[PDB]
Amino acid sequence: MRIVPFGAAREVTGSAHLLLAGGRRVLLDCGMFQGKEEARNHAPFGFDPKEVDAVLLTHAALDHVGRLPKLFREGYRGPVYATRATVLLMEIVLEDALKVMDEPFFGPEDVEEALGHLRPLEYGEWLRLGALSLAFGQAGHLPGSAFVVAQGEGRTLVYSGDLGNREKDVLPDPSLPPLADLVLAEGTYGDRPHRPYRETVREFLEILEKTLSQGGKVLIPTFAVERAQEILYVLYTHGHRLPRAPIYLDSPMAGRVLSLYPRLVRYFSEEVQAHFLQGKNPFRPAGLEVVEHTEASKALNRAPGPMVVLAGSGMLAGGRILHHLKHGLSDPRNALVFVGYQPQGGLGAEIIARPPAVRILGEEVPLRASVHTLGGFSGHAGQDELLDWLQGEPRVVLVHGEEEKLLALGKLLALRGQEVSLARFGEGVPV
Numbered sequence: 376m377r378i379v380p381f382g383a384a385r386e387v388t389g390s391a392h393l394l395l396a397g398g399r400r401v402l403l404d405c406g407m408f409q410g411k412e413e414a415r416n417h418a419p420f421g422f423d424p425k426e427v428d429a430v431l432l433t434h435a436a437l438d439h440v441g442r443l444p445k446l447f448r449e450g451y452r453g454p455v456y457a458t459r460a461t462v463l464l465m466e467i468v469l470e471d472a473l474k475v476m477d478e479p480f481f482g483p484e485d486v487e488e489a490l491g492h493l494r495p496l497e498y499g500e501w502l503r504l505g506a507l508s509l510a511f512g513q514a515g516h517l518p519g520s521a522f523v524v525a526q527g528e529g530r531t532l533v534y535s536g537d538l539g540n541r542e543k544d545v546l547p548d549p550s551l552p553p554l555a556d557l558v559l560a561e562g563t564y565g566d567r568p569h570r571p572y573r574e575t576v577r578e579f580l581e582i583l584e585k586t587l588s589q590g591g592k593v594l595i596p597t598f599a600v601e602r603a604q605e606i607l608y609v610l611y612t613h614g615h616r617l618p619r620a621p622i623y624l625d626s627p628m629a630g631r632v633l634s635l636y637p638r639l640v641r642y643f644s645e646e647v648q649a650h651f652l653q654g655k656n657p658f659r660p661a662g663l664e665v666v667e668h669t670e671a672s673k674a675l676n677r678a679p680g681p682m683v684v685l686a687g688s689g690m691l692a693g694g695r696i697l698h699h700l701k702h703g704l705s706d707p708r709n710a711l712v713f714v715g716y717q718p719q720g721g722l723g724a725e726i727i728a729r730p731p732a733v734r735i736l737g738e739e740v741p742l743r744a745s746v747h748t749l750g751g752f753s754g755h756a757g758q759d760e761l762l763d764w765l766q767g768e769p770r771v772v773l774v775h776g777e778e779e780k781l782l783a784l785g786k787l788l789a790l791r792g793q794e795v796s797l798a799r800f801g802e803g804v805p806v
């Protein structure tokens with residue numbers, strides 16, 4: 376039993392890991408590379424796709440399922456396992472990815488083919504390949520998200536996939552992994568813990584009552600997959616005290632994902648499920664409105680507050696959010712609320728630098744609106760949570776994370792008495 380990193384080595388995108396055991400080949404995830412690494416979705420995998428026996432998907436995000444259609448486009452015809460939640464989500468993530476992409480490295484025939492091989496595998500359901508035993512464990516990072524437990528040849532391996540931030544309320548807490556000979560894990564935030572969730576929410580609510588009470592606009596850059604709906608859920612459970620104002624989810628994509636949420640009730644936390652039982656959708660605060668097209672999206676830039684706006688991209692690469700920022704950053708009464716850390720060098724960071732102006736969409740924009748960064752809405756387990764999850768685990772190979780962040784985690788694990796390594800691309804590791 377060996378596991379071979381084929382993505383997310385000293386980096387956060389590309390997640391794909393080949394497990395060689397029981398005389399079988401099981402591919403754990405198959406995401407694409409993003410941002411600067413995008414061109415690498417064109418390069419080859421590094422293994423023979425036609426030789427793969429089965430595929431397991433930890434969650435529906437593009438950096439975990441994105442290259443799947445390339446796997447089929449290049450031969451593979453085996454089954455692809457994933458929870459029903461990921462199965463349903465995947466279709467929206469993929470269909471959207473096909474429509475949005477400069478140089479697509481796969482076509483509609485591939486997505487179609489890729490989706491046709493999906494087979495439901497729920498938490499605690501065992502898959503039998505050769506003499507290898509596989510099961511999904513609750514990861515709490517996305518509806519239907521999981522980590523992989525693989526046993527065979529008298530040994531146990533655990534592929535964490537992405538672990539969630541247990542302090543939040545939407546998803547159920549990540550399960551502890553069983554004791555394993557080897558643990559391949561992420562370390563997105565191996566360098567630091569997140570600000571507590573409760574105090575992050577209270578701050579969010581103050582910023583909201585403040586700017587809305589003065590007829591101002593609250594601009595919120597958000598990820599369409601699961602960050603948008605979480606903000607909506609916070610707006611819902613606190614709608615009674617917030618000043619009345621429309622909430623524009625300015626994202627067709629976030630809209631599609633949101634419509635799907637009622638079909639996934641079982642994949643949420645107890646708290647969320649209890650709300651649904653009372654017969655009410657807690658992901659739709661009063662006043663929500665899903666803006667479908669450009670014309671209405673731009674009308675908002677010219678319309679007066681009070682209002683709350685959710686738009687992407689979540690890191691300001693592109694999206695409708697830029698347009699909102701362009702016309703709203705100049706008014707001191709508005710407020711920009713980041714609900715996720717902005718990458719260094721990106722426009723976000725540049726904004727947080729709080730200079731006199733910022734270049735957005737070809738023009739220079741005065742920056743008067745207030746700025747707040749609530750890193751506490753993070754979807755990944757922070758360093759402290761990463762440590763508790765990894766406790767008592769003998770050997771650990773880190774993936775998914777910048778080198779520095781991964782190292783900061785390895786140090787602590789090493790001082791704790793655990794054998795740690797930083798996965799290298801192509802270089803398999805023995806379970």
Ligand SMILES: [Zn+2]
Nearest residue numbers: 390438439537
């Ligand atoms: Zn990931």
